[PDB]
């Protein structure tokens, strides 16, 4: 119904997505800290880490894509002008860049903890 509602619904989804990855990586760390983890078990955790990072990137991409499509529909319905359309998409991009940084750093933190416990 307006640019702030589009941007707000996307921010919550990108935060939800980011939170889901944080939680997955926390589960993985707990498994990694179990005693008598064998080499196959370790490798399975490494593969789950990759899949989590990929699913987060894909899910962020989806949330933002959807928001941009919903922004287009506002412009097509005559409910925002050119300024407001571009300003909205700029904001959606910043949101994508911020989410992407947090996901990157969750992965970095996991890797460092996997190396040394």
């Amino acid at each position: 119904a307006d640019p702030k509602k589009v941007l707000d619904k996307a921010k919550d989804q990108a935060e939800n997505r980011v939170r889901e990855l944080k939680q997955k990586l926390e589960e993985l760390y707990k498994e990694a800290r179990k005693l008598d983890l064998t080499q196959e078990m370790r490798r399975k955790l490494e593969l789950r880490y990759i899949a989590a990072m990929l699913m987060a990137i894909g899910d962020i991409y989806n949330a933002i894509r959807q928001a941009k499509q919903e922004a287009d529909k506002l412009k097509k319905a005559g409910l925002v002008n050119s300024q407001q359309l571009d300003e909205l998409k700029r904001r959606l991009e910043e949101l994508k860049e911020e989410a992407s940084r947090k996901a990157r750093d969750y992965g970095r933190e996991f890797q460092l903890k996997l190396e040394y416990g």
Partner: protein, 156 residues
């Protein structure tokens, strides 16, 4: 009629090979194109469009792609099995989406790129990886079919 994930990923890898390293196409990729057989041109409009999207994804997530890839390739013994393992980890629920697909395919293309450009990667590693990614990716075929193909999927 782009209903073959193996073909579009293969065509994307070949297009990517022209933009990177020394340009020339790794024999593993030439053999995969012959055996498939690959009917999509690396210049087909659908390959070109996806290539643009996958390149944006790789640029925006370069650190993550490098670091995940590095952790993947530390073990080269069963790269073919591990590609399937990661693919199935992402999709097994049977709830794919454009963004998950694009992330996967971007990751694969990045891997190929890192493998094929580096003269210090053994042949057998490149072979297992390519064979692994392509075989694993055929898992998206049924979903892409329901969506009207790769071409329809980016129309929206």
């Amino acid at each position: 009629s782009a209903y073959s994930t193996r073909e579009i990923l293969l065509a994307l890898c070949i297009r990517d090979s022209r933009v990177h390293g020394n340009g020339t196409l790794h024999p593993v990729l030439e053999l995969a194109a012959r055996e498939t057989p690959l009917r999509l041109s690396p210049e087909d409009t659908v390959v070109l469009r996806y290539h643009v999207l996958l390149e944006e994804i790789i640029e925006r997530n370069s650190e993550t792609f490098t670091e995940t890839w590095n952790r993947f390739i530390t073990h080269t013994e069963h790269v073919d099995l591990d590609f399937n393992s990661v693919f199935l980890e992402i999709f097994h629920r049977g709830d794919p989406s454009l963004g998950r697909a694009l992330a996967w395919m971007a990751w694969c293309m990045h891997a190929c790129r890192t493998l094929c450009c580096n003269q210090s990667t053994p042949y057998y590693v490149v072979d297992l990886s390519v064979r692994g990614m392509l075989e694993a990716s055929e898992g998206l075929d049924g979903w892409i079919h329901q969506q009207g193909g790769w071409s329809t999927l980016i129309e929206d």
